[PDB]
Amino acid sequence: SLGVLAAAIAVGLGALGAGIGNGLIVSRTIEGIARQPELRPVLQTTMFIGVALVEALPIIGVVFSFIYLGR
Amino acid sequence: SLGVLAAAIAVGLGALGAGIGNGLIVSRTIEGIARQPELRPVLQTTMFIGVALVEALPIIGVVFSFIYLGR
Amino acid sequence: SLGVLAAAIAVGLGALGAGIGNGLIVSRTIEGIARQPELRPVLQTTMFIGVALVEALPIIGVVFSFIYLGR
Amino acid sequence: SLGVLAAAIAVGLGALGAGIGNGLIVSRTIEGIARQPELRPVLQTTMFIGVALVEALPIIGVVFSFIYLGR
Amino acid sequence: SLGVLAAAIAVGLGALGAGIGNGLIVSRTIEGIARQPELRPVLQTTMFIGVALVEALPIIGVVFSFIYLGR
Amino acid sequence: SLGVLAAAIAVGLGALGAGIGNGLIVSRTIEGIARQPELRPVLQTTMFIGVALVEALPIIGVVFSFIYLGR
Amino acid sequence: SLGVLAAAIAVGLGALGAGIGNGLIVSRTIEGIARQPELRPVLQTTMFIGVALVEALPIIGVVFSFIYLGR
Amino acid sequence: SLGVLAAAIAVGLGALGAGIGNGLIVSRTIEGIARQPELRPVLQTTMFIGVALVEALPIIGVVFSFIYLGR
Amino acid sequence: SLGVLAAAIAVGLGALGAGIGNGLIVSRTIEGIARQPELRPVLQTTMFIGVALVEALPIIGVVFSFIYLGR
Amino acid sequence: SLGVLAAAIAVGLGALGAGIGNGLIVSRTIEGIARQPELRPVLQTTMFIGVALVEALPIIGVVFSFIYLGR
Amino acid sequence: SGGTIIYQLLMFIILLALLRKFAWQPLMNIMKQREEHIANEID
Amino acid sequence: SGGTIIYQLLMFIILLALLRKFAWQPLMNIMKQREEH
Amino acid sequence: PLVEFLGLTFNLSDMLMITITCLIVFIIAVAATRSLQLRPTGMQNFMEWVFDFVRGIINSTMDWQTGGRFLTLGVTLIMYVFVANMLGLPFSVHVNGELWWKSPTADATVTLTLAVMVVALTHYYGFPLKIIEEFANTLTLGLRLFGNIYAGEILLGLLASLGTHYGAAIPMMVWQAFSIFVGTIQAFIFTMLTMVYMAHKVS
């Protein structure tokens, strides 16, 4: 009964956290490449490393949402 | 019963996260193109891939809300 | 029974996300046209494609809240 | 019976998102006014079309809230 | 029934949105007076019409809160 | 009964919104009189009218919470 | 019955709003006395009247929480 | 019988407010000691009294949560 | 029955807090290495140090959520 | 039954507050050691006492979470 | 016998194979850089 | 919980002293010898 | 997956994992420290690199004269926590009993007693608000390492069961590379925060 609501709020708060974190890091890397345009590959590689390290815990939230849906 | 409330709270939190994150990215890239307007294609490709990430985690949030509505 | 409250939280969270996103975008473009005044058309075109780009997922959240209200 | 709660939270979330978005755009458009006076008409025209953008979704929200209260 | 807490959560979210928006715009009027204290009339008149804009949708929300409390 | 929950919620969100708005206006006037201290009385007086303006509506929410506690 | 968590949501939202606003005020007053140290007494006196002005409304929220708990 | 939920939301919201307030104060004071080192003791004392304020409201929140769980 | 969405809000708020903290840290690291490329090894080192510190206390919420699902 | 959810919101809000506070502190000390890299220990010790504060109030929250769990 | 043991151990082995194709070139060059640096510091 | 805490505390003290004596006080001696060299 | 204890007092499987990680750390230490060579190569340069890395961390936190003592505690602490985090990933076997040989750090009692052992050492070498901050940093260090290993252990296990029961190689591959990353980052933050509190109480 409550498992589908549990699953949904878990994946929703994971989406909110990943969206805010990715928005912050991508916005600062595009103002960084707007500040110095010859630093673009280093900035975007560290940005993708940041995408992985802000979406670490929402992705585990997604599979725990599948656990919550299964129960 | 609770499945429609689940699907809608998943879509709502994904929309709020995508809205804040994409607002940060698009806002900083138009102020970056306000600083140096000769960097239009680089800023547009980087904002498009950043928005692709910030949207694409609530995209799988939305399709998980569809399979929540099915249950 | 809960479908109306579901559609309500969906439209409301999509509205809050679109409000914060469009606030960020229009705020930074208004300081951008406050800085370089002759960049107004490029900044407005990128601002409107950003506004549509950030309200893409809230309006599909609204048109999914309609079938949430139905189902 | 919960349609009144549904409509009320729809109006409230629309008001909160519209308040944050209008606060951002009005706040740094008066920053743009305070930095230089001569661009007051173009800053105010972009201001009011930004008010239209950040309030439009909110307006839709309150109309759909009356639809929800009618349900 | 629960229309009383419906009306109250409408009042509360309208108060939160109006508080954040008014705080942002009047704070940056202070920052603009600190940058340049000789445009206080135009800064305060654009401040008060921005206050009207941010306050408008919560006042509409609170009069609908009155129509929500009754039902 | 649940009107106690209504009134408390209105009181709480009014306090949260007034706290964030008053924090923004006072913090930016600290910075404003910190950079140019010879201007201090006029910007602190318009800070106080901004304070009354940002906490006008949470006091209205307090009065409506008395109404809701009475109901 | 539910007056105890009514009292508690009142105290909790008042504490959250007081924490955010007071953190903003104190953070701006220490960066103000950091960038120019000679105005420490002036900035501390206006900081203390600002924090009294912020926490005026959560303290009456706490005494309203007392009369909610008594209900 | 909801006093445990009462005390726990009170402690949780007080912890969230104290965390954000302390984060703002400590972050701006390490930026203050970073831009100039020679008055780190002047910065630290005002930082600790700000931490004392922004936690002294959630400390009385925690004590009131104890008397909530007692009832 | 209630422990499932208990565990779900626990892991969801943990994911939200870790996403915001990771976003702030990583965004400031990449803008700092955008300021100068000569210190990107020490800034990546303290980046991963910071990511561990902000992803540490939400994961104790994750494992405590598993404890909550156990009971 | 509800003590599980009480412990869960307590640890979730404590995790959110500690994540945002630690994120702010370590973010601004990244930019602090990026502006002036010879100030690494004097930034680092103040960073760790700030981490101690912003964790130590959610740490006593999560210590209280187990007695919330038992009841 | 359980099935998870050989399954995740086989994918740990193929993950070490991918990390061998990807990763023996950086860290051996870091160790060679340290060795050549300290050899130039000694000789 | 369990009661392994005194077990691995005493085993960590034993392992620490044993390791240091049998491996790394000689490694620190090699480091100090090449620093003086 | 229950707590399999042959003796009522203490967990048997945790003691087995502590013994196997102590023996593997001791044999890699004596394999890296076989003989004396003034020109470093092979694994002795790796052990000297870890040794100077720990030393660098000590030099970041404190004066070299005060913190020179801690170097041989710190290097065995970082290598011990390093191998203790990476043991849970390859095998994690399930037997017909409750559970056997997962990893030591996934047990909460192991990590909390290792953290309180760290803080007992930095009290040994070295007013209510200070002591509640002390107990706060003990339990947040132990819960830090315990949670950030135990969540990954459960996820890897879940992935293993999803694969075996019914195509899903690359999600657990990406997670397992991220998990050895989490293991080395948690070992480094554990020994670095250890040296931070050591420097805070010594000088």
Numbering used by the authors:
A (entry chain c2), B (entry chain c3), C (entry chain c4), D (entry chain c5), E (entry chain c6), F (entry chain c7), ...: 2 to 72
K (entry chain b1): 7 to 49
L (entry chain b2): 7 to 43
M (entry chain a): 6 to 131, 152 to 191, 198 to 234
Question: What text comes from the article?
Answer:
Adenosine triphosphate (ATP) synthases are multi-subunit protein complexes that use an electrochemical proton motive force across a membrane to make the cell’s supply of ATP from adenosine diphosphate (ADP) and inorganic phosphate (Pi).
An improved map of the FO region was obtained by focused refinement of the membrane-embedded region only, excluding the soluble portion of subunit b with particle images from all three classes. Multi-sequence alignment of subunit a from different species indicates that bacterial and chloroplast subunit a contain a larger periplasmic loop between α-helices 3 and 4 than found in the mitochondrial subunit. The location of the loop between α-helices 3 and 4 of the Bacillus PS3 subunit a suggests that it serves a similar structural role, compensating for the lack of subunit f in bacteria. The Bacillus PS3 ATP synthase structure implies a path for proton translocation through the bacterial complex involving two half-channels similar to the paths described for the mitochondrial and chloroplast enzymes. The cytoplasmic half-channel consists of an aqueous cavity at the interface of subunit a and the c-ring (left). During ATP synthesis, protons travel to the middle of the c-ring via the periplasmic half-channel and bind to the Glu 56 residue of a subunit c.
